[PDB]
Amino acid sequence: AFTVTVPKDLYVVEYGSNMTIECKFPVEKQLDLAALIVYWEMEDKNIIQFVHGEEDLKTQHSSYRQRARLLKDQLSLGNAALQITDVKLQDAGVYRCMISYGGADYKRITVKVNAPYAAALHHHHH
Amino acid sequence: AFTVTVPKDLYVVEYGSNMTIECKFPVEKQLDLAALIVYWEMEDKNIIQFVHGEEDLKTQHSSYRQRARLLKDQLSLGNAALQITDVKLQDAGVYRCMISYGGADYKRITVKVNAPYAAALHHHH
Ligand SMILES: CNCc1ccc(-c2cc(Cl)cc(Cl)c2)o1
């Protein structure tokens, strides 16, 4: 049946770098945007809603506001990759890619985030 | 748009009893079963799948074998209620009710489970 697949489920990213986590689903013929739902979340924090044609951000968590860009271009190729700019220590954890396009599945992807000493020191308080 | 709503988000059940946690979604007219999906899952343990008219248990987690039953009747009124039989403390935690019906949402429900001394004594060892 319908199945979202993840090129890798573990990404290890350095502090402050960019990060594109990929998520592929099948595109029958040409992608029907009105029938598509894409939904990126990370440990109960809603990162991105893509519902029947456009992005819902009025539900986006604060900690991700204007850092999480869903590549509206690669949706037409069945790749819902999420791009996060300037990664922080807080961004490490289990991400969930949930897709509903005549069927629905999800996959988990883990991010560990490396940081130099100074970053890990400021995260130890702030 | 589409909205899954949960009558309670906290259940407190005593040990060894049964428990039905409800989950409602909108029913427009007559229900389209082939397009309906019901995932009931609990902290990365899948409890119940409902795809194209039937329950899939091909991934039902060990902890739930023939104890977790989704009431197929109440689907027709948009009621995704889940029954867990003779609950153990391993069942305390946060459940996710996920529904895909021309649109999609989910909600969380937390279960705390109270138990007498001997039962806990076991979950310890
Ligand atoms: C906040 N958007 C909720 C959302 C988007 C996609 C899903 C979903 C639903 C089901 Cl029934 C199954 C699977 Cl695998 C995923 O839920």
Altogether, the residues listed in chain B come to a count of 125
Beta-sheet pairing, B10-14 with B104-114: parallel
C-beta atoms surrounding A1 within 10 Å: 10
Classify each residue of A5-38 as buried b or exposed e, where b means 16 or more C-beta atoms within 10 Å of its C-beta.
Answer: ebeeeebebebeeebebbbbbeeeeebeeeebbb
Q: Could you give the angle at the alpha carbon of A69 between the alpha carbons of A67 and A70, nearest 5°?
A: 150
The order of strands in the sheet holding B19-21 is B19-21, B82-84, B68-70
CA-closest residue to ligand 1 atom 16: B105
Q: Give the count of Cβ contacts less than 8 A between chain A and B.
A: 21
Rounded Cα–Cα distance for residues B12 and A125 (Å) = 35
Under DSSP, is residue B74 helix (H, G, I), strand (E, B) or coil? Answer: helix
CB-ligand 1 contact for B39 (6 Å cutoff): yes
Spatial contact of B67 and B93, defined as CB atoms under 8 Å apart = no
Rounded Cα–Cα distance for residues B46 and B96 (Å) = 10
CB-ligand 1 contact for B21 (6 Å cutoff): no
Expressed in angstroms, the distance from the first to the final Cα of chain B is: 48
Rounded Cα–Cα distance for residues B100 and B120 (Å) = 37
Q: Could you give the angle at the alpha carbon of A3 between the alpha carbons of A58 and B66, nearest 5°?
A: 95
Rounded Cα–Cα distance for residues B9 and B43 (Å) = 15
Chain B: residues touching A (Cβ < 8 Å): 1, 35, 37, 44, 51, 100, 103-104, 108
CB proximity list for B28: less than 8 A, separation 6 or greater? none
Please tell me the total count of domains within chain A. Answer: 1
Note down the domain range covering B123: 1-125
Question: Do the chains contact at A104 and B103, CB–CB below 8 Å?
Answer: no
CA B124 to chain centre: 25
Resolved by: X-ray
CATH for A72: 2.60.40.10
Cα-Cα-Cα-Cα dihedral sign, residues B51, A79, B102, A51: positive
Cα(B100) to centroid of ligand 1, in Å? 6
- This structure's resolution (angstroms)? 2.7
Spatial contact of A96 and A6, defined as CB atoms under 8 Å apart = no
The Cβ-side half-sphere exposure at B110, using a 13 Å CA radius, reads: 2
**Which residues partner with A45 through β-bridges?**
A42
Question: Do the chains contact at A104 and B104, CB–CB below 8 Å?
Answer: yes
Question: Do the chains contact at B104 and A100, CB–CB below 8 Å?
Answer: yes
Rounded Cα–Cα distance for residues A113 and A89 (Å) = 6
